Amino acid sequence: SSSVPSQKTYQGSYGFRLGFLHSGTAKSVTCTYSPALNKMFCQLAKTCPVQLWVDSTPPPGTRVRAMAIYKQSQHMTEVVRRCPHHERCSGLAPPQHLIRVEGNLRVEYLDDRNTFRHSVVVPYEPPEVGSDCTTIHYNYMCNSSCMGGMNRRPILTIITLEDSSGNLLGRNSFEVRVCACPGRDRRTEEENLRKKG
Amino acid sequence: SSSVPSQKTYQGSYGFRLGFLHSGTAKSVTCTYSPALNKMFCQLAKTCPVQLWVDSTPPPGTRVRAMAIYKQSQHMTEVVRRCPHHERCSGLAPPQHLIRVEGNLRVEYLDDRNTFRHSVVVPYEPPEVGSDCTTIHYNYMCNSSCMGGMNRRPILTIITLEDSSGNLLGRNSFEVRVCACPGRDRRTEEENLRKKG
DNA sequence: CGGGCATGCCC
DNA sequence: CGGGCATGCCC
Ligand SMILES: [Zn+2]
Ligand SMILES: [Zn+2]
Numbered sequence: 001s002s003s004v005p006s007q008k009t010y011q012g013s014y015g016f017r018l019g020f021l022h023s024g025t026a027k028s029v030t031c032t033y034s035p036a037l038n039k040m041f042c043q044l045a046k047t048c049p050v051q052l053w054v055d056s057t058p059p060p061g062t063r064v065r066a067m068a069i070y071k072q073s074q075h076m077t078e079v080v081r082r083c084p085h086h087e088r089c090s091g092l093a094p095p096q097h098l099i100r101v102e103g104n105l106r107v108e109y110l111d112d113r114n115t116f117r118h119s120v121v122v123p124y125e126p127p128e129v130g131s132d133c134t135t136i137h138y139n140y141m142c143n144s145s146c147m148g149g150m151n152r153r154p155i156l157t158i159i160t161l162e163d164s165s166g167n168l169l170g171r172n173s174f175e176v177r178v179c180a181c182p183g184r185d186r187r188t189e190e191e192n193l194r195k196k197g
Numbered sequence: 198s199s200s201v202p203s204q205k206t207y208q209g210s211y212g213f214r215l216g217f218l219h220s221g222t223a224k225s226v227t228c229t230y231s232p233a234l235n236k237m238f239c240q241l242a243k244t245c246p247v248q249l250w251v252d253s254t255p256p257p258g259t260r261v262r263a264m265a266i267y268k269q270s271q272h273m274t275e276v277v278r279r280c281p282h283h284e285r286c287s288g289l290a291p292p293q294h295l296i297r298v299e300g301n302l303r304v305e306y307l308d309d310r311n312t313f314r315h316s317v318v319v320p321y322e323p324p325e326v327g328s329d330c331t332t333i334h335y336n337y338m339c340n341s342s343c344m345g346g347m348n349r350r351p352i353l354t355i356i357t358l359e360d361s362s363g364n365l366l367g368r369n370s371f372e373v374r375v376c377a378c379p380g381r382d383r384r385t386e387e388e389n390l391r392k393k394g
Numbered sequence: 395c396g397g398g399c400a401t402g403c404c405c
Numbered sequence: 406c407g408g409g410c411a412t413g414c415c416c
Contacts, residue, residue: 027407074416084281085345145401147344148282152400152414180402184407224396271405342412349403349411377413381396 003115004076007069007156007173015055016161016170019133029183036190039175040157041182044086044143047102050159051133052124054170061164062124065110066099066138067117071154071175079116083149086142093120093141098149099157100139124161140178150178200312201273204266204353204370212252213358213367216330226380233387236372237354238379241283241340244299247356248330249321251367258361259321262307263296263335264314268351268372276313280346283339290317290338295346296354297336321358337375347375 011017020033020040031042031049042048052064068080080098081087087095094109097118101107108121120138127134138157142149154175161170179185208214217230217237228239228246239245249261265277277295278284284292291306294315298304305318317335324331335354339346351372358367376382 083344084285088281088345143402147280147413148285181407185401340413344402378396382412 003117005067005069005115005117005158006171007158008171009173010168010171012161012168012170013056014058014161014169015053016172017053018159018172018174019051019053020174021049021051023182025183027183028181032182032186033174034186034190036193037175037186039177039186039189041177041179041186042140043180043182044178045139045141048138048140048176049135050138050157050174051135052159052161053133054161057126058124058161058169059163062169063121063162063164064124064136065119065121065158065160065162066101066136067119067158067160068098068155068176069117069158070150071156075153079118080155081118081149083142083146083151086146086149090141094118098141100141102137102139104136140176143178143180144176145179200314202264202266202312202314202355203368204355205368206370207365207368209358209365209367210253211255211358211366212250213369214250215356215369215371216248216250217371218246218248220379222380224380225378229379229383230371231383231387233390234372234383236374236383236386238374238376238383239337240377240379241375242336242338245335245337245373246332247335247354247371248332249356249358250330251358254323255321255358255366256360259366260318260359260361261321261333262316262318262355262357262359263298263333264316264355264357265295265352265373266314266355267347268353272350276315277352278315278346280339280343280348283343283346287338291315295338297338299334299336301333337373340375340377341373342376 023029023032030046033040082098093100099120104122106123110119144150145152156173158173220226220229227243230237279295290297296317301319303320307316341347342349353370355370
């Protein structure tokens with residue numbers, strides 16, 4: 001069976017979608033999301049807020065899993081991992097994991113025993129009463145360019161909502177470029193899309 | 198006592214000097230030496246020929262040691278090592294060593310038990326009869342720019358001629374930039390010296 | 395091959 | 406902070 005996880009959007013019966021905060025205009029804003037590109041530009045090891053929106057309430061026990069895969073066909077079968085430098089200079093998160101969640105006391109880090117893929121899982125909590133969404137704080141612990149890790153290859157973050165039995169309730173994904181200057185790089189790729197895309 | 202090794206030239210009683218081969222004009226020539234800068238520009242893990250010239254014959258038992266130190270005052274006390282990526286993707290040479298010698302059956306790699314500095318040593322052989330010099334083939338196993346290793350910091354290679362008792366007979370050093378495009382980078386730094394130096 | 399992009403860093 | 410260098414890589 002395939003060891004490449006699906007990245008196909010599946011908004012499913014709960015109308016699961018992701019949301020992203022607006023950000024400032026700074027060249028090196030800590031994180032900024034491009035709707036045109038469906039791509040987050042963010043700095044390493046800093047907060048990357050991601051909102052979970054649903055139209056209907058997931059059952060008790062639902063989980064929220066994040067996993068990175070390389071976007072390009074030629075790299076999709078290689079597991080996305082922390083580069084050797086950041087692993088050596090690295091609480092619960094194993095040092096080989098690229099994606100962490102901060103501020104959650106129930107985080108689990110998983111190393112799949114068959115596909116070798118890393119994932120990080122937290123329980124689904126429904127929005128607080130006055131609220132339309134639930135926000136998880138992700139961190140990516142290498143730059144996209146890290147030698148011996150992502151090595152400039154774009155990744156997708158796959159977010160899956162899964163019940164406690166392991167049924168797939170919803171799937172969304174967004175591309176990520178972890179970089180020194182998120183504002184600069186987002187503008188550069190939006191301009192490239194307009195001019196050459 | 199100091200754990201920073203001397204880099205001061207000491208041509209000594211044997212009139213020990215280093216020589217370098219001329220190279221071609223290519224942008225990415227595999228190695229090229231700048232006399233103006235006393236600096237070798239070379240690609241990683243490829244041959245970097247270095248000639249040993251003496252006016253008088255070293256005694257039997259003499260050794261030839263190579264060791265890297267950071268050139269800049271602010272980095273001189275840090276040991277020069279292979280970056281974590283190239284160490285993990287790495288015969289006798291320990292994977293943490295930046296400098297190797299190829300084609301010598303008597304090479305020794307040393308990790309100083311007090312200063313933690315790495316060195317690689319081969320016996321001195323006098324030039325063959327028709328010859329003015331002895332050539333050792335060094336390899337540098339990271340680029341100067343390697344993240345988590347040299348990290349763009351220029352190094353000096355220190356070459357010492359040492360008798361078997363450990364007396365210093367001669368010392369010379371040359372700066373090194375290990376890079377993708379030795380021809381391009383040598384020309385760039387020579388032009389910078391002329392214009393801004 | 396040599397022109398020119400890449401992108402963390404400039405000190 | 407934003408202009409511009411850096412330098413392995415372009416696919
Ligand atoms: Zn990294
Ligand atoms: Zn390296």
